[PDB]
Design a protein around this ligand. Structure first.
Ligand SMILES: Nc1nc2c(ncn2[C@H]2C[C@H](O)[C@@H](COP(=O)(O)OP(=O)(O)OP(=O)(O)O)O2)c(=O)[nH]1
Ligand SMILES: [Ca+2]
Ligand SMILES: [Ca+2]
Length: 341
DNA sequence: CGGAATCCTTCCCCC
DNA sequence: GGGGGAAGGATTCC
């Protein structure tokens, strides 16, 4: 069992560089402008020249401009990066039929039925980086190990423009060595629950009654962690498919006025519908981010698919429900369609 | 900002 | 008691 994970590098900013090489060498910040005030928004990603000063995905655009007033600030163009990504996925399909496209910039490849050992996995590594570099001008990091989790961990160590193998004898040392927060699927909230249990390394999950662990972090995440620490995790590479599609926009002002919120909501539906392209949902959820940034949703499943006119009027009922059931002003409003026929 | 998956918890109907 | 859903939220990741 040999897994090869590819993670493109600083992907949105790099696509922006490829499309305008005069940017190379500069710090580049791809931005999501919310539109409220000048430079309201967040940073979607930054290249390494900007990242080394603390500019990174998550921080407000206004914060990045204090740090790096003279960086280049580009608005996010998802559709472009999506096409460039689709193209790259096609290159990887030629190295395995068993391919799992995990996100816009990450894929796993099952190269058992191609390569015989780590030495050859590695070479396939350079072949692939070099192909993508030649054909699309994009640098990627490659991680290789015996399962998907360690393949990813590998790339994270090796990025950017890296390649790295984590072999069976190293898996074993990491299970002891590796900080459990650095395991994929463990965010701040789970890492904290684990400290309180005394777990700071994968291996520690063996010192705990399964039922205490299960009760603290859920059964699913408990099994996941235990199987990992037992050198036994072994999920297969599977083609996955969109289960939902939606759009949330930010309003100019916060509001509780139905007539004020409706147009943003309609525009969210319009765009969601465009994005569905020949796919029909039986579920609709209306999603609202309140002023103190909590997220309240209200949904409805139909026994048939949902036409646009239906989605329009049903979404208004769901928005009225939210307003009736939650006292705060609304900041961001949108829709999500799911359960495709 | 934004997009999305997966999971957990509660509730519900009902054999 | 437990199968079988749906709803709404928690949490995660890019
Ligand atoms: N709008 C938005 N987009 C994000 C965010 N995080 C990641 N992305 C998008 C843009 C990124 O270029 C792309 C890839 O995610 P990554 O976590 O792998 O970041 P990055 O491209 O910098 O990877 P890298 O560290 O260079 O290997 O997905 C985010 O918080 N907001
Ligand atoms: Ca990336
Ligand atoms: Ca981490």
């Amino acid at each position: 069992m040999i897994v090869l994970f590819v993670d493109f590098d600083y992907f949105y900013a790099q696509v922006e560089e490829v499309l305008n090489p005069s940017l190379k060498g500069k710090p580049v910040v791809v931005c999501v402008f919310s539109g409220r005030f000048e430079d309201s928004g967040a940073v979607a990603t930054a290249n390494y020249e900007a990242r080394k000063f603390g500019v990174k995905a998550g921080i407000p655009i206004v914060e990045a401009k204090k740090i790096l007033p003279n960086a280049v600030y580009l608005p996010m163009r998802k559709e472009v990066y999506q096409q460039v990504s689709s193209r790259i996925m096609n290159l990887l399909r030629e190295y395995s039929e068993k391919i799992e496209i995990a996100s816009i910039d990450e894929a796993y490849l099952d190269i058992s039925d191609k390569v015989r050992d780590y030495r050859e996995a590695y070479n396939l590594g350079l072949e692939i980086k070099n192909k993508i570099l030649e054909k699309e001008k994009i640098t990627v990091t490659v991680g290789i190990s015996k399962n998907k989790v360690f393949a990813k961990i590998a790339a994270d160590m090796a990025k950017p423009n890296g390649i790295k193998v984590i072999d069976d004898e190293e898996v074993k040392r990491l299970i002891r060595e590796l900080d459990i927060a650095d395991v994929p699927g463990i965010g701040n909230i789970t890492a904290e629950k684990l400290k309180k249990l005394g777990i700071n390394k994968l291996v520690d999950t063996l010192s705990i009654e399964f039922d205490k662990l299960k009760g603290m972090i859920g059964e699913a995440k408990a099994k996941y962690l235990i199987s990992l620490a037992r050198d036994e995790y072994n999920e297969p590479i599977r083609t996955r498919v969109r289960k939902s599609i939606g759009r949330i926009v930010t309003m100019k002002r916060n509001s509780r006025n139905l007539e004020e919120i409706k147009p943003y909501l309609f525009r969210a539906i319009e765009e969601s519908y465009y994005k569905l392209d020949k796919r029909i949902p039986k579920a609709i959820h209306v999603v609202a981010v309140t002023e103190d940034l909590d997220i309240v949703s209200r949904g409805r499943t139909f026994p048939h698919g949902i036409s646009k006119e239906t989605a329009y009027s049903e979404s208004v009922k769901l928005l009225q429900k939210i307003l009736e059931e939650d006292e705060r002003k609304i900041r961001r409003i949108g829709v999500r369609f799911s359960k495709f026929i």
